[PDB]
């Protein structure tokens, strides 16, 4: 009774959305805007990316690959690796850290997958939605003012 | 939306189906390239490409034939960047035709599965399944 | 440190009357969907296109 | 901690617009063909910058006389009178 | 004292310390010096620990001999470290920005086994750093310092815990050693022993015992007392060496098969064969004192002996039964007890030496990875050691350390002992030790063995209270790492002048006596019951026949800085601690006058702190100038000793030093020949003796605020120079290169008129917020000009010049002079880094004077703001027409506890104005113990209190009533300390007499000048679009969210609103405000923020349509 | 959890049985 | 069965639920942490920035 009550949750919740879980299984994949991932370029040609055109880069990378090789016919063993490291690279760029160790990159620092732009203390969710530096503000210290 | 206002009175969440993303993207990215190497420019049909997400300069197609805002909504015959403002590039968003399917990380593995109540398997069952390690009867007679 | 990503910004007001007038362009893909591609009076339209 | 060292510098825009205001206006006190002479060599009307051949088509004049014209609008404009109020937005 | 040109400063002292304050900087320089092998360690050994030489890199050098491959076929052995000459000087490197280095030359050996030979050469190891004499690196260019570190020591561990659901004792061990690996015997709920080793599932003895060679009836033989090893041996479960250690393959490494030889091997190889298990010469000492295993062996053998192991289980088995002591076969008893984390027989100190050794040993070991993988490939009969040491490792890991890392901190050095306190600082945050919130509260506690060996008093007051704290005075370290601490040795009742050092442990054993005891002039004490500590930290009134240690003088429990605080005995510990905190936070004056009351430790922190020029060899003084100082050293030889006039410091302060000596004087060696920035005469001098009164006054000092006469701006008595420095690098850029060069393109000659010809200002001109220091014009290119701008550009005949500009303009609020102008460039062959064609340093400087809102503090935590300087007529004024100079407010000295300052005040007034003890009728009783030559003292007489040995208040009160009268006859301040002050402002006298004095106050460094800041539009951060952050920038002040709800409490909506979207995010609506508002508009609707969009567009993007619908 | 598809592929690689020239040459030739 | 609803959806739900056939969910009152409250908020939008 319980283990349908949980699964009942989940099928209604499903059934009354009229949402046909379809969205679980994610065909084509949306590219999220140019300058929320900026490349700015810091004086001195130092290039700055944001991380998360690395993990975009992987991910097409592994389906331009996995497109050749389904066009070669290689054999299952290849077409099923390729289409595993497509599955895991669209994991790991909604999500870096779960389904596994996290794909790391210099000095071994895991990326920032857009779940980490949207969770914890560092997302947006936690975060500059809490506090904003102002215009039109200043600071000082201060003194007793015993005339006022 | 694209046009907004100080109305919003109803934020609903709910997943995305495919068949609304190849409606949300105004390109599609397919070359795993950023920006040239020598010249500095965006490539074609990267994942920067001024034709999929707008010019990087106010106003001004790629290949400089249209330049100013007398020109505008247009889109230059040649180079296909429609000339506009340069913060769309802030806001238009790109999609990747896949040519096989693939599934989420979010409503499968997080706990509890979603996907594994839906179907009736166990999280690690699917584990199995969905990552090229098991196959499956769709149907039988 | 400072830095900026590679470009420019104009400051000119978006007059949204006199403009160069244009000419919406179909563009039927091999599925068959319509995409719109607005194109100046004066210019050559090409017959096809990635829409 | 990376300042865009390409944004709107806000004063910059409102000078701007300042400037168009009061370029407009000096532009005004010249006479017919010296405004239409000097806003068409310098592309004020639709930012199209109208060379002297078709100043002097449009107006059926030899470019010659565009090209009086404009000196003599140039050297009226350098008077202080009509210059010093756009001397601070160069 | 002892000093040749001291000041003549008389001491309150009634006790009489015997021994000397040590070099005060020996915990860095005798490190270092270790760490090399100097010759000055060599001997400081053969006097103590004369057993054998260890050179730091020498023992690195022998436990890596030799390199031995696989095959056991080629061998090569690094051996004997040594050190050529330093590159360049210290100036230089600090002013070339060079790492002040000097080489490393090893003699590398090659050997080949199968045909035989040797292949000797002197292979170039790196550039290592070296420590000045001041006990800094300079690495980099900048000066910075190697923290000591206290991390817990290895050794053995008994701890104990209860169990609530049993309520019974749980014994336990852990023996952390280094390099190696954790074991666990512990005894469990039930009465059985766990042995868990290396972290998995436990084990019980026998296994490890049959498994160590002995028998169950060994197990007996040796453990037959122990009731709970017999009942263990009952429940042992398993007998049998070969199947036991067969068991401990098969669990300890899970599923591999469990053959006999790669288990009995591992056994070693875990915890015998020492290249995967070194417990060091520190744990290896610390073990031997705990289990008495050797006295006389010298400290060798760095690995386990199964001896030890067998002896643990028996300790920790008899702990359990309870015992007292315990005698092992083979060695000296020791007693069994338990051990702390704390106490500082367990936590040790990993000097500067110790923490590059292991920084060099981390670079070792990968280049003998490297080393031996590269001799495998290579072929035989053709390489050498030269083709095998690859020296990037040891590079790489020293530039890491020194470099980036959290123990090389820059020397905060505002005043000489800011310099002298971040050296002797202890630092628990480091890496091998606990983040700031891993800290175990536990750990930041005094635990009674820090008496002595860690000042109680300083520590930040921070989020790092206890973390960060700073060596006592008289404390020394340890060869093995351990702070001794020397005291005195009391037998048969008499107290000797043999100083003796112990450690904590001894510390523990034996029993300590006070220093301000009486002793009879024989070394005998007086009263039979006398104040002593026990070992637990108790306090106890002993008989005068059981003190074997007594301390060697007062103040021993106290750092270098807080010893320097006058009636600090008065102060509560809360005040006392941010008097030390900030008595390292003082600026140099341009005048630095000395305190008139201080303690002994303004003389020898200076002396030491290297902020003050040392005759070096005795001598006469020939030519004495501002800049150099000519000593003809009496044998012949000559030396010219030279100044740093104006040389900017790491904070931003000047750094003069001035000649203190005449060109006929004689000097001797050892005395102070050059004040520094904070120092007169060779005393430590942080501020100005002003003249304070305690009276609150018509509200302007309230609530710690402070107010000023206009004389200590207009005489300039507190004022700082701060000499900042800029700096433009031209770098190449794609589209062409950056010329510093005069012209500039709007630039007019006006604003030009500084510049010179290459584009930097002319040493002397008064630059302000705006100016062009350095002229730098950039390539830019054609890029479009708008109709209008080409329009005004041909009518005013100004043309593009598309090189832009982007030259160096003074921050805001950074006026002053420029002193000197240093321009680094690639033709002068200076090695810039890559790309800068030209780097230009200016160093401006400005003369900042006192102002509202600077902050002065006494040297007893009595902080404040200048809430206002008044004229001088304005100033309560004494009956003679003296004004005050500044006006503390009483309501803040009962509450804090610190009357300190009330007693500083009256005696500082009796050191002004000089007293004279009425002893015509013989000493007054109130003078009695009073020293001599104090019976009469001279007007700005200087005077001492030592810390805790100072003036008794009775000497205060006495002093207070017999002092002498200024010119007139006029005893301005009567016997109960207080003076009638006439109001400058009304003119009535004041109805009651107020508290006057002379008071040694200090200007900190948070002046106004470096906190106030303004913006109305600035600059705007990449990613979201806020106003960015920080005065270096712009930016705002963060308005976060308990501000937030601070205006949702009040239901301001509309301002909300604003500052949430149309100040910080609404990216079109800010110029559209700008706009309005330059129009003289209404302020627009505000719209919807940018951290409300490239949220959606992430939703859209982690695919979840999150959609906005009215309706 | 044996998360890592390095194993996951090596494990499933080391099955087809490894060949030789003679094989090869029957091999190449039937291709 | 277990799961916590708002007091006046229930009264609500029962006021609906006598009609068309009378059942009434049986509820009692229950008293719950502060941070256990504030976890049961219905916008997502809070739910999450939490
Ligand atoms: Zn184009």
């Known amino acids: 009774k319980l283990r349908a009550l949980k699964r009942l949750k989940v099928v209604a919740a499903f059934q009354q959305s009229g949402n046909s879980p379809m969205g679980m299984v994610l065909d084509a994949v949306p590219v999220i805007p140019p300058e929320l991932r900026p490349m700015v370029q810091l004086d001195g040609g130092r290039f700055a990316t944001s991380d998360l055109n690395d993990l975009y880069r992987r991910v097409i990378n592994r389906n331009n690959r996995l497109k050749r090789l389904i066009d070669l016919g290689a054999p299952e063993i290849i077409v099923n690796n390729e289409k595993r490291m497509l599955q895991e690279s669209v994991d790991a760029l909604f999500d870096n850290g779960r389904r596994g160790r996290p794909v790391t990159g210099p000095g071994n620092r895991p990326l920032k997958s857009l779940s980490d732009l949207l969770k914890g203390k560092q997302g947006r969710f936690r975060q500059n939605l809490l506090g904003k530096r102002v215009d039109y503000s200043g600071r000082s210290v201060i003194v007793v003012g015993p005339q006022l | 939306a694209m046009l907004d206002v100080n109305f919003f009175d109803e934020l609903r969440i709910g997943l995305a189906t495919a068949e609304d993303i190849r409606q949300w993207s105004y390109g599609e990215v397919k070359k795993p390239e950023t920006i040239n190497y020598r010249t500095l420019k965006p490539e074609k049909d990267g994942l920067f490409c001024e034709k999929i997400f707008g010019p990087t300069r106010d106003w001004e197609c790629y290949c400089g034939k249209y330049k100013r805002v007398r020109f505008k909504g247009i889109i230059c015959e040649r180079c296909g960047v429609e000339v506009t403002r340069a913060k769309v590039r802030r806001e238009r968003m790109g999609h990747i035709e896949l040519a096989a399917p693939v599934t989420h990380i979010w409503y499968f593995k997080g706990v509890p599965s979603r996907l594994g109540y839906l179907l009736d398997l166990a999280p690690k069952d699917l584990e199995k399944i969905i990552y090229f390690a098991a196959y499956v009867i769709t149907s039988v007679d | 440190l400072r830095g900026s990503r590679l470009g420019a910004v104009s400051y000119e007001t978006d007059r949204n009357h006199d403009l160069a007038p244009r000419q919406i362009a179909r563009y039927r893909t091999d599925n068959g969907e319509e995409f719109e591609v607005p194109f100046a009076d004066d210019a050559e339209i090409p017959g096809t296109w990635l829409c | ?90 | 004292n002892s000093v040749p040109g001291a000041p003549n400063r008389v001491s309150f002292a009634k006790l009489r310390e015997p021994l000397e304050v040590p070099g005060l900087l020996d915990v860095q320089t005798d490190s270092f010096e270790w760490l090399i092998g100097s010759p000055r360690w060599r001997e400081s050994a053969a006097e103590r620990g004369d057993v054998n030489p260890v050179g730091g890199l020498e023992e690195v050098l022998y436990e890596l001999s030799p390199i031995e491959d696989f095959s056991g076929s080629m061998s090569l052995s690094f051996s004997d470290p040594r050190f050529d000459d330093v590159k360049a000087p210290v100036d230089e490197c600090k002013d070339k920005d060079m790492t002040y280095a000097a080489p490393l030359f090893v003699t590398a050996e090659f050997i080949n086994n199968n045909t035989g030979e040797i292949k000797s050469q002197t292979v170039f190891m790196g550039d290592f750093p070296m420590m000045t004499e001041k006990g800094t690196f300079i690495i980099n260019g900048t000066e910075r310092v190697v923290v000591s570190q206290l991390v817990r020591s290895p050794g053995v561990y008994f701890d104990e815990t209860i169990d609530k659901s049993t309520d019974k004792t749980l014994h336990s061990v852990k023996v952390i050693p280094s390099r190696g690996a954790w074991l666990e015997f512990d005894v469990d709920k039930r009465d059985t022993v766990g042995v868990r080793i290396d972290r998995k599932r436990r084990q019980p003895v026998t296994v490890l015992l049959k498994a160590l060679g002995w028998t169950s009836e060994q197990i007996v033989e040796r453990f037959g007392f122990s009731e709970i090893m017999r009942s263990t041996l009952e429940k042992d479960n398993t007998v049998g060496t070969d199947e036991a250690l067969l068991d401990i393959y098969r669990k300890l490494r899970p599923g591999e098969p469990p053959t006999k030889e790669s288990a009995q091997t591992l056994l070693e190889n875990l915890f015998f064969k020492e290249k995967r298990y070194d417990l060091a010469r520190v744990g290896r000492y610390k073990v031997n004192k705990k289990l008495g295993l050797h006295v006389g062996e010298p400290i060798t053998s760095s690995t386990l002996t199964e001896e030890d192991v067998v002896a643990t289980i028996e300790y920790l088995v008899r702990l359990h039964e309870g015992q007292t002591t315990m005698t092992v076969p083979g060695g000296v008893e020791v007693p069994v007890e338990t051990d702390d984390i704390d106490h500082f027989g367990n936590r040790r100190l990993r000097t500067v030496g110790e923490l590059i050794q292991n920084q060099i040993r981390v670079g070792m070991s990968r280049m003998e990875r490297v080393v031996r993988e590269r001799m495998t490939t290579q072929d035989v009969e053709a390489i050498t050691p030269q083709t095998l040491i690859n020296i990037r490792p040891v590079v790489a890991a020293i530039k890491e350390f020194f470099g980036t890392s959290q123990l090389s901190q820059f020397m905060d050095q505002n005043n000489p002992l800011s310099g002298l306190t971040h050296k002797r600082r202890l630092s628990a945050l480091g890496p091998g030790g606990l983040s700031r919130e891993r800290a175990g509260l536990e750990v930041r506690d005094v635990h009674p063995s820090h008496y002595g060996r860690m000042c109680p008093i300083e520590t930040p007051e921070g989020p790092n209270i206890g973390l960060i704290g700073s060596l006592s005075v008289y404390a020394r370290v340890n060869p093995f790492g351990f702070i001794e601490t020397p005291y005195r040795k009391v037998v048969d009742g008499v107290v000797s002048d043999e100083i003796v050092y112990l450690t904590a442990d001894e510390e523990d054993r034996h029993v300590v006596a006070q220093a301000n005891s009486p002793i009879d002039a024989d070394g005998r004490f007086v009263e039979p019951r006398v104040l002593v500590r026990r070992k637990a930290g108790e306090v106890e009134y002993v008989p005068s026949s059981e003190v074997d240690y007594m301390d060697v003088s007062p103040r021993q429990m106290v750092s270098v800085a807080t010893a320097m605080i006058p009636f600090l005995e008065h102060d509560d510990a809360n005040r006392a601690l941010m008097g030390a905190n900030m008595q390292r936070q003082a600026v140099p004056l341009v005048r630095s006058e000395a305190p008139l009351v201080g303690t002994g430790m303004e003389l020898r922190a200076a002396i030491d702190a290297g902020d003050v020029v040392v005759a070096e060899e005795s001598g006469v003084i020939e030519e004495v100038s501002a800049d150099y100082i000519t000593v003809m050293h009496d044998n012949g030889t000559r030396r010219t000793y030279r100044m740093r006039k104006f040389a900017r410091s790491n904070h931003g302060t000047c750094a003069n030093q001035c000649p203190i000596v005449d060109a006929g004087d004689r000097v001797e060696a050892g005395q102070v020949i050059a004040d520094g920035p904070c120092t007169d005469d060779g005393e430590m001098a942080l501020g100005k003796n002003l003249l304070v009164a305690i009276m609150p006054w018509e509200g302007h000092n309230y609530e710690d605020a402070i107010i000023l006469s206009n004389r200590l701006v207009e005489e300039d008595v507190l004022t700082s120079i701060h000499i900042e420095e800029h700096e433009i690098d031209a770098r190449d850029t794609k589209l062409g290169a950056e010329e510093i060069t005069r012209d500039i393109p709007n630039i007019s000659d006006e604003v030009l008129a500084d510049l010179d010809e290459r584009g930097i200002v002319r040493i002397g001109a008064e630059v302000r917020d705006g100016d062009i220091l350095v002229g730098k014009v950039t390539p830019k290119g054609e890029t479009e000009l708008t109709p209008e701008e080409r329009l005004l550009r041909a009518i005013f005949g100004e043309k593009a010049r598309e090189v832009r500009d982007t030259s160096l303009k003074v921050p805001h609020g950074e006026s002053g002079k420029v002193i000197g102008i240093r321009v680094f460039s690639r033709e002068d062959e200076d090695e810039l880094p890559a790309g800068v064609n030209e780097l230009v340093r200016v160093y401006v400087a400005q003369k900042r004077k006192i102002s509202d809102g600077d902050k002065l503090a006494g040297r007893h935590g009595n902080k404040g703001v200048i809430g206002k300087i008044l004229p001088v007529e304005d100033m309560p004024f004494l009956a003679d027409g003296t004004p005050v100079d500044i006006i503390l407010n009483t309501h803040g000295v009962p509450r804090r506890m610190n009357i300190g300052q009330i007693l500083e005040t009256h005696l500082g007034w009796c050191a002004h104005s000089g007293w004279k003890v009425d002893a015509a009728k013989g000493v007054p009783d109130w003078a009695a113990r009073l020293p001599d030559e104090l019976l009469e003292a001279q007007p700005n007489a200087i005077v001492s209190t030592p810390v805790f040995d100072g003036a008794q208040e009775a000497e205060l009160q006495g002093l207070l009533s017999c002092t002498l009268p200024n010119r007139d006859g006029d005893v301005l301040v009567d016997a109960d300390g207080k003076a009638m002050l006439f109001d400058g402002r009304s003119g009535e006298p004041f109805p009651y007499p107020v508290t006057v004095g002379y008071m040694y106050i200090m200007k900190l460094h948070h002046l106004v000048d470096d906190k106030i800041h303004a913006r109305s539009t600035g600059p705007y951060s990449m990613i979201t679009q806020q106003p960015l952050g920080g005065k270096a920038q712009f930016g705002g002040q963060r308005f976060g969210e308990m501000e937030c709800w601070a205006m949702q409490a009040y239901g301001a909506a509309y301002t909300l609103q604003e500052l949430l979207t149309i100040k910080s995010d609404d990216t079109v609506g800010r110029v559209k405000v700008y706009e309005a508002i330059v129009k003289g508009e209404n302020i627009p609707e505000p719209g919807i923020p940018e951290s409300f969009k490239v949220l959606l567009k992430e939703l859209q993007s982690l695919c979840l349509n999150v959609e906005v619908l009215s309706s | 959890a044996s998360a890592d598809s390095v194993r996951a592929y090596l494990k499933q690689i080391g099955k087809v049985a490894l060949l030789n020239a003679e094989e090869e040459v029957e091999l190449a030739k039937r291709i | 069965p277990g799961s916590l609803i708002d007091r006046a959806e229930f009264e609500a739900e029962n006021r609906r639920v006598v009609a068309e056939g009378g059942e009434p969910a049986a509820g009692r009152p229950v008293l719950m942490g502060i941070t256990k409250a504030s976890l049961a908020t219905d916008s997502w939008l809070s739910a999450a920035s939490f």
């Open chain 4, 1 to 90: 901690f990376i300042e865009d060292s390409e944004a709107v510098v806000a004063v910059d825009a409102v000078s701007f617009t300042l400037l168009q205001d009061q370029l407009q206006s000096v532009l005004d006190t010249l006479s017919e063909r010296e405004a239409g002479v000097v806003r068409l060599r310098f592309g004020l009307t639709d930012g199209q910058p109208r060379t002297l051949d078709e100043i002097g088509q449009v107006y059926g004049v030899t470019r010659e006389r565009i090209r009086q014209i404009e000196s003599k609008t140039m050297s009226k404009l350098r008077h202080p009178s009509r210059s010093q109020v756009l001397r601070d937005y160069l």
